[model samples]
Target: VQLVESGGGLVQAGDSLRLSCAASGLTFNRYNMGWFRQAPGREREFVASISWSGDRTYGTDSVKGRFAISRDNAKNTMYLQMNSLKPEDTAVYYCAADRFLTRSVKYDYWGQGTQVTVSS
Candidate 1:
């Protein structure tokens, strides 16, 4: 399985951005997908997740209103959209998928990191 990430770039603070991760070689709709990110000096953090049926779950209250996740099963792709971005939101974002059969929620598929810059 493979995931290709795209759509990250230099974006002004308070602006909005949309990032995409396209999946291939796997049955994309069978499992839930997740989005993660890591800033320059911080550990990776979960941003959001989308189940096969389009249900969304956010990892933190900070993302409740400003961040959103969506997907198109036909395209085998997932998307992340951020609004009113801040400088602190600059990070390298990644997309991932959980394993078919495993405990503790492990992600076996990952996308190449997409670096996003929220400039002031």
Candidate 2:
């Protein structure tokens, strides 16, 4: 899987930011993409997961209203978009894959996380 940062860091509170992760060696149709967040000193937390068909599953307690996840199955790429950001949303973000056949829905592959800081 390949994860690429789409834009530079330092986003303002109301701007839109897009981050993408792509898969090449494997088939995206056979897996789902997931997003996670890691605050400065805290552990990573599950953000959301998007299926090949564009369906999404979010953690029970996760903040899902303002975050979006989508995938282009043809290109094997998945994207995460965050809009109307807040300082609380500043953190390191990562994208991962969840291969369906596994017993645990573990994130076996990950992208080099992008550190995004929000400000005025």
Candidate 3:
């Protein structure tokens, strides 16, 4: 399976950013989509996740207030849209397909990465 993420450009602080990731070669409807981010030289940031059905959403406590995750079964696409963005939020973000285990869910397949630059 392959995941491709694109669509990120310059944005000013207080602005919003949305990224789209297309999924292929996989039954995306069976798995959820997760969004994560990493600064150039910093550890990763756990954003949030959305079930493929688009009914359930789980957010990381640290970022729940800002990041929103969603998936469109018809489009075979996942979205990571954040509101009130800041320069500190600038990073290379990734979208992944989450596999459901007997116990819980986790990301298994991921996209390359989308670099976001925010200023002003």
Candidate 4:
């Protein structure tokens, strides 16, 4: 399976950043899709995830109220949205599939991270 990421450039503070990950060669809705990010010096952290049933779960408090995750099964794509951005939000965002294999969960598929910069 492969995932390609798109959307991210220079976004201004207070504006919203929208990203998408297109999945190929697999059944997209059969697994969970998640978004993660890593700033200049910070460790990569979880943002949110959308299950096969379209239910969402926000794993980190840093982006709880401002972040949203969703999927379009027909297009085999997942989306990530962040609103009211700020400089501190600059980071490289990535999307991955949380797959279940042998009763263990693994994040084996990933997108080529999209870089986002929040400007003043």
TM-score: which candidate is best?
A: 1
Q: Which ten residues in a row have the lowest lDDT in candidate 4?
A: 98-107
Q: Residue-wise lDDT of candidate 1 within 1-120, one digit each (tens)?
A: 889899999999899999999999888889788888889889888888887766788876668699999999889888998999999999999998874421223577788889999988
List, residue by residue over 11-47, the lDDT tens digit for candidate 4: 8889997899999988787988888888899988777
The per-model lDDT (C-alpha) reads 0.85, 0.73, 0.76, 0.83
- The order of the candidates by TM-score, greatest first, is 1, 4, 3, 2
- Tens digit of per-residue lDDT, candidate 2, span 15-113: 778888766677678887888878777778787788656678665433567778788887777788777788777888887777652223367777778
- Per-residue CA lDDT of candidate 3, range 60-115, in tens? 45366776777788899988878888887888888788766211324678788888
What is residue 109's positional error in candidate 1, in angstroms? 1.1
For candidate 4, the TM-score is 0.90
lDDT of 4: 0.83
Q: Could you tell me which residue pairs clash in candidate 4?
A: none
Specify the poorest-scoring 10-residue window by lDDT in model 3: 98-107
The per-residue C-alpha lDDT of model 1 at residue 2 equals 89
Q: What residue pairs are clashing in model 1? A: none
Better of 1 and 4 by TM-score: 1
Higher-ranked by lDDT: 1 or 4: 1
Q: Return whichever of 3 and 4 wins on lDDT.
A: 4
